[PDB]
Amino acid sequence: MKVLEERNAFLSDYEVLKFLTDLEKKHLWDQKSLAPELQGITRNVVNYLSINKNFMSDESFAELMTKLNSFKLFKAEKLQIVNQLPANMVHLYSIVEECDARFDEKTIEEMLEIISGYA
């Protein structure tokens, strides 16, 4: 079919999660009612995307986006680090491009782990 704007309004993963959460409250629940060919992906996206928060943020999301606004970087990698949560490793370096430096090690460790562990 004729598309109009392909790459428009890059949204995060938690926004998709809360959209499919609020999509299954218009009708009967997916988990509370467990105890037409559309509920499959509806219960499979919400099950697969919640695998990293195992052993939730509206105002904490606001504080986190202001903290990401405190220092500047590239465009979509802020979305990548606000979704992947790189906390207990050096995976932030794995996000932003080569040359492992931009700023020194005792600052990348704390600006990684406080931000990605408070959320």
Binding site: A9, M65, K72, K75, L79
Partner: protein, 97 residues
């Protein structure tokens, strides 16, 4: 109405009708198809005589208009719903760079 008095005969139906199939409903056939294929008539279907051949609805009488059904929806429901989507990417993209 064309500026000349020409009646209804073999040479009379060619006054305005561009329709080849309407002019194929008359005697002395097998000569109006070949010059229509030679001079390459575009032949936009508008007359009722070539809408009953193709099975189309005619544009006179009952099919001279269209009826459509109103949705009766307001602009309050057709809103671009939005709550904290592009706020993260707008501030940390033009700061000190």
């Amino acid at each position: 109405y064309k500026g000349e008095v020409l009646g209804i005969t073999r040479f009379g139906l060619s006054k305005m009708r561009d329709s080849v199939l309407q002019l194929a409903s008359f005697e002395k056939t097998t000569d109006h198809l070949f010059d229509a294929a030679f001079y390459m008539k575009k032949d936009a279907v508008e007359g009722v005589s070539e809408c009953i051949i193709l099975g189309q609805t005619m544009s006179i009488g009952t099919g001279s208009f269209k009826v459509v059904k109103g949705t009766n929806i307001s602009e309050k429901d057709l809103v671009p719903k939005r709550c904290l989507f592009e706020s993260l990417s707008n501030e940390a993209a033009l700061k000190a760079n």
